[PDB]
Amino acid sequence: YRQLVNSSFADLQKP
Amino acid sequence: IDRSRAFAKDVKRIVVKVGTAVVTGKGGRLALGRLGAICEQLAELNSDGFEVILVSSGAVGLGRQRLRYRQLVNSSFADLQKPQMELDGKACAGVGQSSLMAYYETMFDQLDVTVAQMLVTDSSFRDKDFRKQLSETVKAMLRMRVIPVFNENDAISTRWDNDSLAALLSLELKADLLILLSDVEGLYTGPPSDSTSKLIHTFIKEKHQDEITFGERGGMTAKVKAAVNAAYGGVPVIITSGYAAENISKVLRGLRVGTLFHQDAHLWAP
Amino acid sequence: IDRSRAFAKDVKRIVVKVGTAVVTGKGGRLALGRLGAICEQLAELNSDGFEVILVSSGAVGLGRQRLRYRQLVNSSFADLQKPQMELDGKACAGVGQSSLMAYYETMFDQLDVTVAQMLVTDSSFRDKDFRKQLSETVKAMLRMRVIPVFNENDAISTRWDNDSLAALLSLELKADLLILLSDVEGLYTGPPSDSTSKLIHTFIKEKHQDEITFGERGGMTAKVKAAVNAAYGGVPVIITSGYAAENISKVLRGLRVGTLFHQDAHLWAP
Amino acid sequence: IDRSRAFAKDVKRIVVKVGTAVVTGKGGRLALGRLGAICEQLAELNSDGFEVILVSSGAVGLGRQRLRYRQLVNSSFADLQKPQMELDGKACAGVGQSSLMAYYETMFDQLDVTVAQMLVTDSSFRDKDFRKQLSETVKAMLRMRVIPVFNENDAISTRWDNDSLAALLSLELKADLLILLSDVEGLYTGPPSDSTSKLIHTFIKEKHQDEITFGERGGMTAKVKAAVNAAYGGVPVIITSGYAAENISKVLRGLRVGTLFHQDAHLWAP
Amino acid sequence: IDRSRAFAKDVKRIVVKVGTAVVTGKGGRLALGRLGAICEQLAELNSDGFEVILVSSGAVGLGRQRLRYRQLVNSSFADLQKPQMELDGKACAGVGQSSLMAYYETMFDQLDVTVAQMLVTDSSFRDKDFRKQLSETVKAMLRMRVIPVFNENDAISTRWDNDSLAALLSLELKADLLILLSDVEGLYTGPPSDSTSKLIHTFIKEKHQDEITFGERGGMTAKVKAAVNAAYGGVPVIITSGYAAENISKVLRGLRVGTLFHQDAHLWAP
Amino acid sequence: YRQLVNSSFADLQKP
Amino acid sequence: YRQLVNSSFADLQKP
Amino acid sequence: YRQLVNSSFADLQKP
Ligand SMILES: Nc1ncnc2c1ncn2[C@@H]1O[C@H](COP(=O)(O)OP(=O)(O)O)[C@@H](O)[C@H]1O
Ligand SMILES: Nc1ncnc2c1ncn2[C@@H]1O[C@H](COP(=O)(O)OP(=O)(O)O)[C@@H](O)[C@H]1O
Ligand SMILES: Nc1ncnc2c1ncn2[C@@H]1O[C@H](COP(=O)(O)OP(=O)(O)O)[C@@H](O)[C@H]1O
Ligand SMILES: Nc1ncnc2c1ncn2[C@@H]1O[C@H](COP(=O)(O)OP(=O)(O)O)[C@@H](O)[C@H]1O
Ligand SMILES: N[C@H](CCC(=O)OP(=O)(O)O)C(=O)O
Ligand SMILES: N[C@H](CCC(=O)OP(=O)(O)O)C(=O)O
Ligand SMILES: N[C@H](CCC(=O)OP(=O)(O)O)C(=O)O
Ligand SMILES: N[C@H](CCC(=O)OP(=O)(O)O)C(=O)O
Ligand SMILES: [Mg+2]
Ligand SMILES: [Mg+2]
Ligand SMILES: [Mg+2]
Ligand SMILES: [Mg+2]
């Protein structure tokens, strides 16, 4: 969850 | 047809300006239908032997929409809690100009019309050679059946709205008509909201200048200034709503619509 | 990896220039494949944390193609016997800039990249305020992950090629690398045609300047001048063929390809 | 709000059909403004939580325009004296479908909406498995916030208009509303030209079927047939002019506009 | 020029197939440069008096990319922790076909070429009338200097790859050459990875069929099957890498590149 | 024929 | 924060 | 002139 809360939306797009 | 619009029978070169309230719609996105109908009307005019010149606007807003999207795409959820910084205006215009030009080119290709982009700054107009060369280039482009689309280069400026730029080009190019497409049906003696303000049909500098009570880029005060400038200079000025594209054809058909600015209206005063 | 290209490990902001021999192909039409591969490489670089700046060219040629088509469409058969007059150059650039910008915007949208158009004239660079404000705007756009695409506004000029403009922007913006994409594999001691000319890998101002024998906008003499300017100024310069898009990644990977212009090459002299 | 349109408060899945008299304008070219306003309205509806399905048309006409242009471009002046042969219809549809799909995709990308193209022939509807699988696929696409755009594959047919296809899909997909965008304000008891024909607001199969006197793909007889089919089946049907895009929002707001086909109108008979 | 490719001097109607490994590049996005060079080559061939037919592919992948983007745009952060469901394939193809067709139309308009979209399912080929009518329509389109672009309608199928569809169309249309653009330089006696596999130049059904050891839509086994089918049928088959667009011109120039499938190779056996 | 020899290609496009 | 953690990216785009 | 009267518009486009 920490990683997600510190990701940029674009990052979520890339595996 | 009233003689107040008798000049509509011999108008050959016209200048059309579209404000940001016309090109951009909800949420800062492009008003597809409105802007598309305007382009259809312009292509129809160009086919019938008219040489038109379009001064558009809407670069800043589109730019802002796109840049905000990019910011949100790149942001990190932990950053959507704190408030975001307010975007750079010149970058916004730089993006919006490219987007608007691509969109215009797409639908003018769809209508089988060739268009050219001319971005001019205020500082460039201080040279006589620049004005002469611009007149030559625009004359050549108009002779080649191409619609010039001007604007102010905001991305590179070091700072006079498009309305004033429109008047300038119409006077420098000796155009026969200047049309200002706004979001309102025309000039009003007061705010359009109240019922105590009526629709003008002919502007009289001596009379009509005092009783107008404007509200608190440039709003309508600027528009009026630019129009009066163009008129005095020699080019009639017409203000009409850009929400209905058929307003252009009706204006060119002599139909009495919109607000007019003619120096000869002193004699044509009813 | 030779130490002559050791700077490729810390290059962050780069400037890429594409000549007209790269953007335009047969018949003055757009080189779709070449230009598309270049854009793919640029988008890949932008994703990996680089801030790139593209100075393109090809406006004049595309414009000419389109305007010639329009002339032929409007001509009357009785006019195809007599010879046609030669098109206006500034109108040509005005049309070509819009077409090129729309095309660039289309495929950068396809690659999910936001781009902005900045057209700057020579006369605008005589103000210190202009340079400061341009640096601020470009810094903001690069921080917002947007690729600026510059060029010279030919449509409005009153006349320094893009090569010189590239060098200027790279020195004013303190970029870490300047890449000149040409149609040849790189600088040569003579004409590329003969077999007596070999491929340089490092340019030495003291040595290599005399024996070069160039042929009879700006060709390669101008390119060399601009490169040496940028180098002396502080920004390394790389010249490589734009026909293979993977040349960009190879250059950024430290691979020894193309011609280099570094002031430190005096110490790095082999 | 009259209770005759009380169903407009719970309509969730709707089907919108645009006729060739709406998509195509003068000279067989695309009606940019009209079609753009329709797309803007559809995107606005899609944002507000509606799942819409568009069945369009205009492939044949656009195709014909483009193919005629190509024929004229390739013709030899000595061939413009003799009369040209009349173009193949299926080739015309094949070109027009691609052009229309590209144009739709362009402006739905502009409005930030994803669209999908589904071309279905009459012969494919004779399999139960096909209908089940189509329902599953369309349900998935609607759940994914994507607007399906159907049509008949004319390019490959071996031959039921879009109106009938619309009714079919609306009944197979259990849509809550079927809107038929035509060029007229709605159904009429006679030809719209004369002043002896008045505007219907609710269609009664028992009563209103006899006194209607239609003139001499499918015109309005077909439209009425398809509408009555959809109604009987269970899906209300609304016929309204496609010239004003705000008609869609007004219909979805419960405003009494257009012609309605409800089986419950027997009880709602005034 | 070896006599094994002597047929290249009289080939007039050709069929070109592009696999998904050619049209789609990194991340499921469109391979702009590769696909653009292919289109440039096809337009050049079309200008020189050839009638080409393109069977493309890449709908499913593009569709998937776009739909994934839409899912991520609509998702709620609380949903990015749990694993997302796997997308519907037919919806994916439905979106991808539209996107690919729009992209193809854009750059074929850029190259001044008219294209048409033909989507055909397997179930439609069970009627003799369908084949006759398809041959007539394709003949008319080819005579009108238009490039047909076929594919399988996946969005509506109830399920034979494009390779097999290519062979089918090439045999039904009596084309003079069938080119299969793959990601590899051609057929190999084994996997391309190891150094023990060499490049074939002519395929012999009697000899070469046994020693080939393929690995574990359709891969290369299917490709070979389809090629042998087309050959036996009468239409030579050429397999070559689609990464270099000049391979097409080299093949049409008689240069010995790629893998060939000719029934006459029994006599032309070296 | 005179009309044709004095038409502009665009004109041929319009009836 | 709860609202954000329960918003869809698109929602963040609209004020 | 004969050549012109027997050319296709496209041909005129190419030198
Ligand atoms: N006296 C007036 N008559 C008409 N409109 C006025 C008046 N005073 C203010 N306005 C307002 O000015 C607006 C148009 O100015 P502006 O917004 O600058 O045009 P645009 O931005 O579209 O170029 C109108 O929407 C109108 O409400
Ligand atoms: N000494 C040299 N070494 C390499 N190329 C040279 C030399 N002298 C002249 N050239 C020519 O200059 C050309 C590149 O200059 P230019 O045409 O101005 O680039 P572009 O127009 O693509 O920006 C090359 O095609 C090359 O043949
Ligand atoms: N009784 C009627 N009421 C209304 N319209 C009618 C009637 N009879 C014929 N029409 C004509 O039918 C036309 C609409 O049918 P059609 O052309 O098939 O729609 P589209 O082609 O736009 O799908 C209208 O333009 C209208 O003039
Ligand atoms: N004997 C073989 N010779 C060549 N390629 C082979 C062989 N066996 C398997 N392949 C593989 O098959 C692939 C091409 O098949 P395929 O992926 O179906 O093409 P596409 O998907 O591009 O249409 C090549 O990448 C190649 O590595
Ligand atoms: N740069 C231009 C400025 C135009 C302008 O300020 O005038 P207006 O938007 O009031 O017509 C733009 O915003 O698009
Ligand atoms: N106006 C620009 C000039 C660019 C220029 O002259 O430099 P080059 O075309 O040699 O790279 C154009 O032609 O596109
Ligand atoms: N192939 C479709 C047929 C559609 C059709 O015939 O119905 P209509 O054009 O009357 O709405 C087209 O013409 O675009
Ligand atoms: N629907 C088509 C299927 C094509 C296909 O499976 O063949 P291949 O992708 O192996 O060339 C697509 O995926 O684009
Ligand atoms: Mg203003
Ligand atoms: Mg040069
Ligand atoms: Mg009908
Ligand atoms: Mg396969």
Residue numbers in the entry:
A (entry chain F), F (entry chain H), G (entry chain E), H (entry chain G): 72 to 86
B (entry chain C), C (entry chain D), D (entry chain B), E (entry chain A): 4 to 162, 174 to 230, 236 to 289
How does the study describe this entry?
Delta-1-pyrroline-5-carboxylate synthase (P5CS) is a key enzyme in proline biosynthesis pathway. As a bifunctional enzyme, P5CS has two structural domains: the glutamate kinase (GK) domain and the glutamyl phosphate reductase (GPR) domain. Our results show that Arabidopsis thaliana P5CS1 (AtP5CS1) and P5CS2 (AtP5CS2) can form enzymatic filaments in a substrate-sensitive manner.
We first determined the cryo-EM structure of mixed-state AtP5CS2. Each helical unit is a tetramer, in which the GK domain is located at the core as one tetramer and the GPR domain is located on both sides as two dimers. Helical units are arranged in a perpendicular way, and an obvious interface consists of hooks located on the helical axis. In the GK of AtP5CS2, we captured density corresponding to adenosine diphosphate (ADP) and G5P. The gamma phosphate group of RGP has a specific interaction with the surrounding amino acids, with the side chain of amino acids S60, T23 and K20, and the backbone of the amino acid R236 involved in stabilizing the gamma phosphate group of RGP. Besides, between the RGP and ADP, there is a magnesium ion that was previously observed in the model of DmP5CS.
